[PDB]
Amino acid sequence: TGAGRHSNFLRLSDRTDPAAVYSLVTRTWGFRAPNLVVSVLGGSGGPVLQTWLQDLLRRGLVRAAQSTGAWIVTGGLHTGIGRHVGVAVRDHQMASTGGTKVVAMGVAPWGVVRNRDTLINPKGSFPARYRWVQFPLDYNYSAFFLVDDLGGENRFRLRLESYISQQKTGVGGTGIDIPVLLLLIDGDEKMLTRIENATQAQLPCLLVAGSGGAADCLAETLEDTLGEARDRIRRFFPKGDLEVLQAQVERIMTRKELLTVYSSEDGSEEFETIVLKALVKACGEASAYLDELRLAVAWNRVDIAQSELFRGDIQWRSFHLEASLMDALLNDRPEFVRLLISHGLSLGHFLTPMRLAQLYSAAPSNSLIRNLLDQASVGHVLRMLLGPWSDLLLWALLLNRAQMAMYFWEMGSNAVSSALGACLLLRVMARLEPDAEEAARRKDLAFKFEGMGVDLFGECYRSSEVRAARLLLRRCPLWGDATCLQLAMQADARAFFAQDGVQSLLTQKWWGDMASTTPIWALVLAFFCPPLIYTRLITFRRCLRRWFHFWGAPVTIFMGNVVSYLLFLLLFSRVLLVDFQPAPPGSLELLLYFWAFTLLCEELRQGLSGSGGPGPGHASLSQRLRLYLADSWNQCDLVALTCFLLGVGCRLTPGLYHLGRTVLCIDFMVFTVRLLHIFTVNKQLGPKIVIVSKMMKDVFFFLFFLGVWLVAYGVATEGLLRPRDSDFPSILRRVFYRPYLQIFGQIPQEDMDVALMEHSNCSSEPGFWAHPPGAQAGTCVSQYANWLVVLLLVIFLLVANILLVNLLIAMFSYTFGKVQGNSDLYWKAQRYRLIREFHSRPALAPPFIVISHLRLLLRQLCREHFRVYLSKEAERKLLTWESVHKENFLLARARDKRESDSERLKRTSQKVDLALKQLGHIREYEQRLKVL
């Protein structure tokens, strides 16, 4: 047989398998591994059970099913106890309309189901529907383990539930042995010898008081602890052979402790703790200590785990909490983790490296991590990670455990650097991830650390701008002496650079030891008077270091690079305009050639001295030059320097002289546009230089729409008035160039409109002609339909000069509104990349840079990493100050979360739920009075 009806049944024999049944439950058509199993035994006489036993199953047992997984093992027939359990499952899945569709295996015998369609003998794969001492099968159970031997299936289930109890619970097969328990609603003679075997296989029976035949016969005995038992057994059994029915009860009562009585009218909401109560008496000192709190973790029920630890003779020792946090970590369950750390663990006796290797061993097999470990058994993390909070925070980032990493960040030191560090990993490790489904969660949890790093630093910056400046430039001993700005660069942390604390910190790094509120004109006055450096103007924070704080600062290296480049373009122009005769190169032209060699020697310094890509110190030039020729400026810097080289090579050869001048005039154009890339570091200009490249998508639409209209206008005008000087350079000029200039107010009416030109007899061709006075207007044009050419100009100036130009302004004004936020956000992050690009550059500019290249190359024959230095005791005062402001920040967000309106409505509704749970006790006062 196979599945059918969408339940998954099969027929088997008694002797078959403990394991190949349960593997065929869990692997094939897998529901889950349970967190317990409540096997229910004891039939009625045929009619309906009592109302409170029905309510014990309604919202006492199946409530504990949907809360804890917890598949129920029953008969399956619609007349035994499986009817009444089947009533409860069918009730509860419509009672709570959300639900989780509780699972219940109805282990039945094959020779009882009367409407057997004999499911499809090839392989048992049918979806075959059932037609609804010959009892049927339900439609309410998720399975039906039909047994082809009501006696045969009993030795199977006790063989089954013993195997279930041997199976461990937890991801990776480690954790607790699963809890199995028999639930004994009242039965018969056979029900007493049923649960004797359960004690022999060590099953914690859970008989219910006030039930009847088999339960209350045993319930009166378990309260009869330290000749009367002759009488009381006969009270529930009018049937004979009382003697072994006496004698087997003491065989049960040899155990006496793998057995508890569900007290009548004392549970039904406490049932989930009474179930919990029976297991501890069962484990209480051999069976793999169940510890009562490790169990509540495995059930994934938080409210049990608090009240167990907050109350109930609170004497929790070390190892009681130690293995409890393992299953809180191995199974995902982050809310249990915060509870245990709130009651405090060691974390120096907890993070022993076996347990970390244990923690990484429970990674899922088909991950991008387990194989990534086995591949290794960002890429340096693989060479660093192998199988008190930082290693634990590292773990939860690696396995994409979101709320675990959000918590482990909160319990450790180094809040800002590990928030930037978490953003660094999850952007790197998403690129190292094959599939893009989980990379959406990997990138979302990177934004959540981007939120907390920006939020916590903005608190620390408004606290003390000086002491939070030291937060970035601290020598972080992680990552081989990393810096938090360097951490934010490699993370591509655009939101972290965008905040006003980091941006005001960048100006202070920009004006390095020169008091960044200094004016600009005083820097100009001190650049062109180095005597004026030591004066009443620019303030700073040995007169030789005072010299080097000025000329080593990135604004003066910038202004050195700007002054020396405006003088390059002034030398370039004075060569190009007045010193460029076909003679061999003179004084200033050779000075220009050396100047642009240094420009090229300064171009290879960025090339062989150059994370969202490779790591620092790649040392193979197929990455360093590939990342060089990827900057859009270098591409401009090399096009400039290569056609300077073309313009000089063509100049020096005698034939190609005018082509060498022509290439150098376009070469001035490209060196001057590189003036834009230099001033994008400016706060006033820079965010607007980055805008004007976002405008190119609208220029290209305009240039498309105009060019189509310029072909349309230009050929139709050149076709209507037919010039007689129709050379292809002049035809392609009156078609394109002359209409293009009409957009800019150069409208040659005298060349297109015949009524404005005289000399109307200028061609022997038939028709009437007229002479336009323009030089490239044709010798004579036609005057056939020159009403149209004049009309067709009017349509041109309307479309081009009014429709196209003013719609381009609407397109610029729109996309300036969109990209203003995002390109300023992009410029903020780009800014620090340009601050330290001048800080690492030598202090001497382009023409005099050869001094600082004959100093660097003489360094090799004799053989910017920004980090402020401070003492370790002043360094730990920083992290102590900053871990206070993390705690003052997490507790501030926790109060704002609790005092939110969405969480008062949660806490009000749960207190009305607490009212009705306790006012329902008051209702049962009527029964308390009716007995009175």
Residue listed under structure tokens 């003036």: 675
Q: How far is CA 335 from the centre of its chain?
A: 20
Q: How far is the CB of 445 from a second copy (least distance, A)?
A: 19
Instruction: Give least dist CB 830 to a second copy, A.
Output: 39
Closest CA to 172 of 370, 393, 336: 370
In the block, tokens 């954790």 appear at 175
- Alpha-carbon distances of 480 from 103, 453, 487, 669, rounded to whole Å: 53, 21, 12, 44
Least CB distance to a second copy at residue 339 (A): 7
634 binds, among ligand Y01, Ca ion, a second copy, none (CB under 5 to 8 A by kind): Ca ion
What are the residues facing 885 on neighbouring strands?
none
Name every residue whose Cβ is closer than 8 Å to that of residue 609 and which is 6 or more positions away in sequence: 840
CA 335/CA 326 separation, integer angstroms: 13
Phi and psi based region of residue 87 (left: phi greater than 0; alpha: psi -120 to 50; beta: remaining): alpha
For the bound state, the minimum distance from the C-beta of residue 561 to ligand Y01, rounded and expressed in Å, comes to: 9
CA pair distance 66, 96, nearest whole angstrom: 10
Find which of Ca ion, a second copy, ligand Y01, none residue 926 binds, CB within 5 to 8 Å per kind.
a second copy
The verdict on whether residue 291 carries a ligand-binding annotation is: yes
Using DSSP, state whether 620 is helix, strand or coil: coil
Q: State CA 669 to chain mean position distance.
A: 45
CB of 16 to a second copy, least distance (A): 32
637 is in an annotated binding site: yes
Q: Are 337 and 180 in contact (CB under 8 A)?
A: no
Closer to a second copy by CB, 813 or 902: give it.
902
Number of chain residues interacting with Ca ion (CB under 5 A): 3
Answer yes or no: is 177 a known binding residue.
Answer: yes
Task: For residue 553, give the nearest of 542, 537, 534, 540 by alpha carbon.
Answer: 540
- Least separation in angstroms between residue 509's CB and ligand Y01 is 12
Residue 143 CB, shortest distance to a second copy, in Å, is 17
Contact footprint for a second copy (CB under 8 A): 48, 58, 87, 90-91, 93-95, 97-98, 132, 139, 306, 309-311, 313-314, 318, 339, 342-344, 891, 894-895, 898, 901-902, 904-909, 911-916, 918-923, 925-926, 928-929
CB of 691 vs ligand Y01, minimal distance in Å: 8
Choice from 68, 418, 634, 730 touching Ca ion (CB under 5 A) = 634
Closest distance of CB 558 from ligand Y01, Å? 5
Which option in ligand Y01, a second copy, Ca ion, none does residue 246 bind, with CB closer than 5 to 8 A by kind?
none
34: its two tokens: 């349970």
Q: Please choose which of Ca ion, a second copy, ligand Y01, none residue 520 contacts, taking the beta carbon within 5 to 8 angstroms, the exact cut-off set by kind.
A: ligand Y01
344 known ligand binder: yes
Q: State both tokens at 584.
A: 């061999």
The span from the CA of 497 to the CA of 502, in Å, is 6
Give the nearest distance from C-beta 231 to a second copy in angstroms.
35
- Rank residues 268 and 730 by Cβ distance to ligand Y01 and give the closer one: 730
First to last CA, the chain: 58
Q: How far apart are CA 319 and CA 193, in angstroms?
A: 39
* Residue 637 site contact among Ca ion, a second copy, ligand Y01, none (CB < 5 to 8 Å, cut-off depends on kind): Ca ion
Identify whether the C-beta of residue 687 lies closer than 8 Å to the C-beta of residue 831.
no
Nearer to ligand Y01, 331 or 634 (CB): 634
Q: Which is nearer to a second copy, 317 or 541 (CB)?
A: 317
895 contact choice in Ca ion, ligand Y01, a second copy, none (CB below 5 to 8 Å, kind-dependent)? a second copy
Specify the residue, 198 or 844, whose C-beta has the smaller distance to ligand Y01: 844
Nearer to ligand Y01, 436 or 524 (CB): 524
Per CB under 5 A, 882 contacts Ca ion: no
Beta bridge partners of residue 261, listed in sequence order: 207
Regarding 637 and contact with Ca ion (CB under 5 A), the answer is yes
Q: Which does 858 bind (CB under 5 to 8 A by kind): Ca ion, ligand Y01, a second copy, none?
A: none
Binding site partner of 524, from Ca ion, ligand Y01, a second copy, none, Cβ cut-off 5-8 A by kind:
ligand Y01
Which position has the token pair 């061999």? 584
Q: How far is CA 741 from CA 348, 386, 725, 753, 800, in A?
A: 79, 70, 20, 16, 11
Please state the length of the chain: 932
Please give the single-letter amino acid code of residue 670: V
SS3 of residue 589 by DSSP: helix
Dist. CA 692–CA 706, nearest whole Å? 20
Distances from the Cα of 77 to the Cα of 107, 141, 323, angstroms: 9, 10, 42
- Strand, coil or helix: what is 511? coil
Nearer to ligand Y01, 165 or 598 (CB): 598
Q: Which is nearer to a second copy, 543 or 932 (CB)?
A: 932
Q: Which is nearer to ligand Y01, 645 or 695 (CB)?
A: 695
Give which of Ca ion, ligand Y01, a second copy, none residue 313 binds (C-beta under 5 to 8 Å, depending on kind): a second copy
For 41-60, give one letter per residue: b (16+ CB within 10 A) or e.
bbbbeeeebeeebbebbbbb
Q: Name the minimum Å distance from CB 790 to ligand Y01.
A: 22
For residue 107, give both structure tokens. Answer: 């282990």
* CA distances for 222 relative to 22, 120, 194, 762, angstroms: 33, 49, 17, 131
**Which entry of a second copy, Ca ion, ligand Y01, none binds 666, CB below 5 to 8 A by partner kind?**
none
Give least dist CB 120 to a second copy, A: 19
Which residue, 145 or 497, is less far from ligand Y01 as judged by CB? 497
State the minimum distance, in angstroms, from the CB of residue 731 to ligand Y01.
Answer: 9
84 vs 42, 65, 138, 211, 219, CA distance in Å?
11, 15, 11, 14, 22
433 labeled part of a ligand binding site: no
Nearer to Ca ion, 200 or 606 (CB): 606
- Contacts to ligand Y01 by CB under 6 A: 520, 524, 555, 558-559, 562-563, 566-567, 569-570, 632, 673, 676-677, 681-682, 689-690, 692-693, 696, 703, 706-707, 710, 729, 732-733, 736-737, 740
Q: What angle do CA 366, 371, 374 make, to 5 degrees?
A: 145
Q: Does 717 bind Ca ion (CB under 5 A)?
A: no
> Residue with the closest Cβ to ligand Y01?
729
- Give whichever of 232 and 724 is closer to ligand Y01, judged by the CB atom: 724
CA dihedral for 353, 354, 355, 358, sign (positive or negative): positive
How far apart, in Å, are the Cα atoms of 113 and each of 45, 137, 158, 820, 837?
19, 6, 21, 74, 82
Residue 288 annotated in ligand binding = yes
By C-beta, is 447 or 925 nearer to a second copy?
A: 925
Annotated binding site for ATP: 90, 137, 317, 344
Q: Which residues contribute to the site for Ca ion (CB under 5 A)?
A: 606, 634, 637
Annotated binding site: 90, 137, 177, 288, 291-292, 317, 344, 603, 606, 634, 637
Annotated binding site for Ca(2+): 177, 288, 291-292, 603, 606, 634, 637
